[PDB]
Short mmCIF file of C-alpha atoms (C1' of nucleotides) in Angstrom, two decimals:
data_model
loop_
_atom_site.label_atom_id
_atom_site.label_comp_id
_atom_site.label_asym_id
_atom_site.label_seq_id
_atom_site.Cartn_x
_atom_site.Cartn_y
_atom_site.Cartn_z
CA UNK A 1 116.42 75.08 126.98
CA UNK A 2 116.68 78.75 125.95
CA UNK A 3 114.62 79.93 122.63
CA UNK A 4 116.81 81.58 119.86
CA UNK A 5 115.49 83.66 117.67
CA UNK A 6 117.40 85.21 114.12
CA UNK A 7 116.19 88.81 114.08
CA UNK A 8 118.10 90.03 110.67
CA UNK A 9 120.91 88.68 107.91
CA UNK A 10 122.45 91.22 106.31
CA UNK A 11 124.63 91.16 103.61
CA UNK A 12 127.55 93.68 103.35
CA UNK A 13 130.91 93.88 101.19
CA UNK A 14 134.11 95.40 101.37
CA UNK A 15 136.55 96.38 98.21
CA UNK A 16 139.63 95.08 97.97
CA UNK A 17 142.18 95.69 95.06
CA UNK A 18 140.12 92.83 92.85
CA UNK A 19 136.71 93.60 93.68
CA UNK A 20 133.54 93.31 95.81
CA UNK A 21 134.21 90.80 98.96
CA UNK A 22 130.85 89.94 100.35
CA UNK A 23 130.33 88.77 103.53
CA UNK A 24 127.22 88.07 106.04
CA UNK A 25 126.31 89.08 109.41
CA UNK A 26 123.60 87.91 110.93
CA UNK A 27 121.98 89.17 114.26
CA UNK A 28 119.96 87.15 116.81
CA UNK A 29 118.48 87.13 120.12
CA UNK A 30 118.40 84.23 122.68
CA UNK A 31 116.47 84.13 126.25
CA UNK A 32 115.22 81.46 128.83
CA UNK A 33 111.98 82.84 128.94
CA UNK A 34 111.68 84.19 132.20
CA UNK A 35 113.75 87.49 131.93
CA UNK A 36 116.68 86.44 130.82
CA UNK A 37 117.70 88.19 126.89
CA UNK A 38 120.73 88.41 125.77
CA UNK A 39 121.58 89.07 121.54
CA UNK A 40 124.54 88.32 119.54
CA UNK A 41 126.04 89.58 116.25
CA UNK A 42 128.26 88.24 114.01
CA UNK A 43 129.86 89.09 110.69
CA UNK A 44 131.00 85.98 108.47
CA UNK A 45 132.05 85.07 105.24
CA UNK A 46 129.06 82.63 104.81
CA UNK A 47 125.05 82.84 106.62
CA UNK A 48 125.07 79.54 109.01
CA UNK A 49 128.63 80.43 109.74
CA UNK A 50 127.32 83.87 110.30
CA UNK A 51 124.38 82.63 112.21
CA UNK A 52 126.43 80.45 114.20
CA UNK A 53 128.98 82.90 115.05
CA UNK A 54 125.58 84.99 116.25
CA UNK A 55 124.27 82.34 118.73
CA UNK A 56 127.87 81.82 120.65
CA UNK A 57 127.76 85.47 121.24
CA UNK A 58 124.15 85.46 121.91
CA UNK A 59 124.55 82.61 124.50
CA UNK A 60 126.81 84.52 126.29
CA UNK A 61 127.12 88.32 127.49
CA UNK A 62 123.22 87.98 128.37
CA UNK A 63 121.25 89.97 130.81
CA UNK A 64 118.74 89.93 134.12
CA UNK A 65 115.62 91.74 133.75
CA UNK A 66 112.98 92.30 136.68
CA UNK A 67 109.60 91.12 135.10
CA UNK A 68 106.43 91.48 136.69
CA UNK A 69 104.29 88.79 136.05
CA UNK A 70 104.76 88.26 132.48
CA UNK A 71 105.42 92.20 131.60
CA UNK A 72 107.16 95.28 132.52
CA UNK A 73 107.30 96.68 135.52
CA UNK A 74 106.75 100.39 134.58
CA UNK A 75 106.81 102.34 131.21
CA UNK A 76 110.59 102.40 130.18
CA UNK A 77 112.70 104.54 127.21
CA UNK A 78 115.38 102.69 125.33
CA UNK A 79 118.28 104.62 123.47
CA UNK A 80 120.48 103.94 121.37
CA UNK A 81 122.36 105.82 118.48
CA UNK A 82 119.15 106.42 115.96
CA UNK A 83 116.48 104.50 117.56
CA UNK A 84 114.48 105.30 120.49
CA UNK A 85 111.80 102.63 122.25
CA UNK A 86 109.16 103.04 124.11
CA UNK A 87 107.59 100.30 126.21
CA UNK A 88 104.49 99.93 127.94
CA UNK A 89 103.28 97.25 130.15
CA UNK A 90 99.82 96.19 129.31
CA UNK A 91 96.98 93.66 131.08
CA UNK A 92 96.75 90.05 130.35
CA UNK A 93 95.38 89.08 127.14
CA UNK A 94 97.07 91.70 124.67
CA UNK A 95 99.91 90.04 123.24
CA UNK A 96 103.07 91.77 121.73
CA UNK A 97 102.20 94.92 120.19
CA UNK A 98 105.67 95.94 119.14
CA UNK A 99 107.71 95.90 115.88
CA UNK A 100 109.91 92.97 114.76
CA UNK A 101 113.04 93.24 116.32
CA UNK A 102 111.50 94.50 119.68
CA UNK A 103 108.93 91.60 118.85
CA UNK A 104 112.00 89.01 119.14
CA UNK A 105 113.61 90.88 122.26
CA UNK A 106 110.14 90.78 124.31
CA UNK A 107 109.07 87.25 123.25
CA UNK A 108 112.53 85.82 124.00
CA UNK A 109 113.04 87.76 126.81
CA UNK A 110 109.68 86.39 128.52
CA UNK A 111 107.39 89.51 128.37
CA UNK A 112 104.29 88.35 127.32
CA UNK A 113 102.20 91.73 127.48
CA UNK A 114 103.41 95.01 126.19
CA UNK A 115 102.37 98.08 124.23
CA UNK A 116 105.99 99.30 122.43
CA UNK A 117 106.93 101.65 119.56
CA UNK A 118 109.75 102.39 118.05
CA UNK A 119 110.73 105.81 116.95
CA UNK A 120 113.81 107.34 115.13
CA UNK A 121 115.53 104.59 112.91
CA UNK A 122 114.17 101.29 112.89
CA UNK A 123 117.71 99.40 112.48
CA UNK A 124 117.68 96.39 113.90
CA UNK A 125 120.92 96.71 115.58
CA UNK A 126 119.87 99.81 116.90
CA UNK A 127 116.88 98.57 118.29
CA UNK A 128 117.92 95.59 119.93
CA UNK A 129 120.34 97.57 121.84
CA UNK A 130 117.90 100.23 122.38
CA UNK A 131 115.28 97.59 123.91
CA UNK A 132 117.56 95.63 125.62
CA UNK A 133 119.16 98.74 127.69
CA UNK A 134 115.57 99.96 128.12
CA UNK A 135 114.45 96.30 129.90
CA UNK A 136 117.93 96.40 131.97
CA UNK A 137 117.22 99.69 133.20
CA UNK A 138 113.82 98.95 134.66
CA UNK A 139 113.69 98.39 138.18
CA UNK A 140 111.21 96.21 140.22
CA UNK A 141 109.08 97.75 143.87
CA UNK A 142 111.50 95.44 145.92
CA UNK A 143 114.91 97.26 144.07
CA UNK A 144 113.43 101.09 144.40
CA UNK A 145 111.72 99.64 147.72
CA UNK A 146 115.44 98.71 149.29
CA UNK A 147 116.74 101.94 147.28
CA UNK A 148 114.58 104.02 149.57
CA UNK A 149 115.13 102.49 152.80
CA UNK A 150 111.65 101.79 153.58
CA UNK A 151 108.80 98.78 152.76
CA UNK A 152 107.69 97.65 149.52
CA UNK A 153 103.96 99.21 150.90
CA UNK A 154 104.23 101.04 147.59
CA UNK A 155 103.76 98.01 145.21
"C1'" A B 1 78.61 94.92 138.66
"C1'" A B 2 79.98 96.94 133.42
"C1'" A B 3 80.26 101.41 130.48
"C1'" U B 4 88.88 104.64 127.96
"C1'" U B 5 92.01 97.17 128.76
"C1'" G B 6 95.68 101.19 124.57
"C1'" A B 7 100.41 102.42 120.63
"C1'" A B 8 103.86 96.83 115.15
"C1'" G B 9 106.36 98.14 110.63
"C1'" A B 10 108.45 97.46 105.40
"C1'" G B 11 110.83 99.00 100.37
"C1'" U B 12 113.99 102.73 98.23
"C1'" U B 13 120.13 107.32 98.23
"C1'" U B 14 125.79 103.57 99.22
"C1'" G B 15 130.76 99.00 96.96
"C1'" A B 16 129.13 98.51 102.05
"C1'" U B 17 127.76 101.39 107.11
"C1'" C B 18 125.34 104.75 110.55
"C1'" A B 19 122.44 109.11 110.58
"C1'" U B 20 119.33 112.75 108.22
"C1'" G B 21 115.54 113.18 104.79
"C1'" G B 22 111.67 112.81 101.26
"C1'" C B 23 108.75 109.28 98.09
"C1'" U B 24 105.92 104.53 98.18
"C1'" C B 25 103.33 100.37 100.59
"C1'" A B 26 100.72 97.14 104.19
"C1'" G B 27 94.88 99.49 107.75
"C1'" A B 28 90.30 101.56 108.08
"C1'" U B 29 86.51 104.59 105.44
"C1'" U B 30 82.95 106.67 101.15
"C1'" G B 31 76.28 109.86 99.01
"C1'" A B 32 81.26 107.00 95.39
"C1'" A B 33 82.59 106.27 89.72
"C1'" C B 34 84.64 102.82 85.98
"C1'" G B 35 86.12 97.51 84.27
"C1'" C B 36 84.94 92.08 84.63
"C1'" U B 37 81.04 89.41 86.82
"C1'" G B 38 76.27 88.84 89.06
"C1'" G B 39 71.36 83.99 92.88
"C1'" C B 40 67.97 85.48 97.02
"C1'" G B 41 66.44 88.28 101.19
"C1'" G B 42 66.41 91.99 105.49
"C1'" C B 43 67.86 97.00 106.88
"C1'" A B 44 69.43 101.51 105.19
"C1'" G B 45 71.19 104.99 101.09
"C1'" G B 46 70.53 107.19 96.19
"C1'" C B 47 71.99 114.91 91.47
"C1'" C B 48 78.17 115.61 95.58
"C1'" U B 49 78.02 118.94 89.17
"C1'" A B 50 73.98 123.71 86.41
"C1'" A B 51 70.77 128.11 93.34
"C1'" C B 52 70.82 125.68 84.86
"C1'" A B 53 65.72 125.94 82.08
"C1'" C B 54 61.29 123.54 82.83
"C1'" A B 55 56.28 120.09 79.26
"C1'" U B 56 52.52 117.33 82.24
"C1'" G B 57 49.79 115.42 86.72
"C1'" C B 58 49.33 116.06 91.92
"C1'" A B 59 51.78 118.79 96.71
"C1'" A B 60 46.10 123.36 101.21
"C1'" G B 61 42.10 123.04 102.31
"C1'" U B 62 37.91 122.98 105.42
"C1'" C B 63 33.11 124.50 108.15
"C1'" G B 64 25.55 124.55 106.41
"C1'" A B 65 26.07 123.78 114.23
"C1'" A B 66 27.86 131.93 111.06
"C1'" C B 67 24.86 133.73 106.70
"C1'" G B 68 21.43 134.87 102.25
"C1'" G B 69 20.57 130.93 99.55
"C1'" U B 70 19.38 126.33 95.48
"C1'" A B 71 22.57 125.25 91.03
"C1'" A B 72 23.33 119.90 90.76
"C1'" C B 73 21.22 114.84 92.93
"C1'" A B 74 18.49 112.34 96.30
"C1'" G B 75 14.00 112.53 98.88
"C1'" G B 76 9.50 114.33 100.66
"C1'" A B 77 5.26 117.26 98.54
"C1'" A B 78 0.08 119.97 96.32
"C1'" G B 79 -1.78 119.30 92.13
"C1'" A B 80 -2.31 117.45 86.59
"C1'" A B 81 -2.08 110.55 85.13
#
RNA sequence: AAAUUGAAGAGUUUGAUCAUGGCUCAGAUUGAACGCUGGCGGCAGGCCUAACACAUGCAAGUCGAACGGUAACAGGAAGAA
């Protein structure tokens, strides 16, 4: 009973000795809720079939992240290629203050409270990856709390 | 007790892509102006330009318990109706 969630279609075309081919890809984001995201992308003659082909891949290759009661643990830095993210955790009652595709990633992913921004290129691609290796990269007090060798008397 | 609890993006270069990069938009705000329209009230605001020139009226008077006084109006007055 994950939520899906169809982040951006986008319509590109390669030329072939006749013409223009066009073909779809579509990019999406799925997630239980409870810190579990995991996005898919795929390219497709046709949008459902594009959308479609998004969702398998979605459903699959998703990833663990260490929420703390509804938001982020710490302030984290997502990068990839053009886009960088920045994420904030915030107190209860804010919302989602981030742009659309990190919208999709945090709401899917179960953070309900968050201050993000996104800097560099907005691509939605680029940002998806950018948020999702920022959320996989942030670390919980029991992880750096084990990391250390001593208690959690840090949390 | 409280008195920083706060951060959103989108369009546009290409057949298509990523990046760079500028332009534009979505938000607030104003001593505002113009266009269409216009019922009431409360609170505020109202020459941003020519420190350009000014008709007219007012905007700095007061004290007789400082003084010589009596010109005006109100009285007291002696004497002539």
């Amino acid at each position: 009973e994950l939520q899906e969630k169809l982040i951006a279609v986008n319509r590109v075309s390669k030329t072939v000795k006749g013409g223009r081919i066009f073909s779809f890809t579509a990019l999406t984001v799925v997630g239980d809720g409870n810190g579990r995201v995991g996005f898919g992308y795929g390219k497709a003659r046709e949008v459902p079939a594009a959308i479609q082909k998004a969702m398998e891949k979605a459903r699959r290759n998703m990833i663990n992240v260490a929420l703390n009661n509804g938001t982020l643990q710490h302030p984290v830095k997502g990068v990839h290629t053009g886009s960088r993210v920045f994420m904030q955790p915030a107190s209860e009652g804010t919302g989602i203050i981030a742009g659309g595709a990190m919208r999709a990633v945090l709401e899917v992913a179960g953070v309900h409270n968050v201050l993000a921004k996104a800097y560099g290129s907005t691509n939605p691609i680029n940002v998806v990856r950018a948020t999702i290796d920022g959320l996989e990269n942030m670390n919980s007090p029991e992880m750096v709390a084990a990391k250390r060798g001593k208690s959690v008397e840090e949390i």
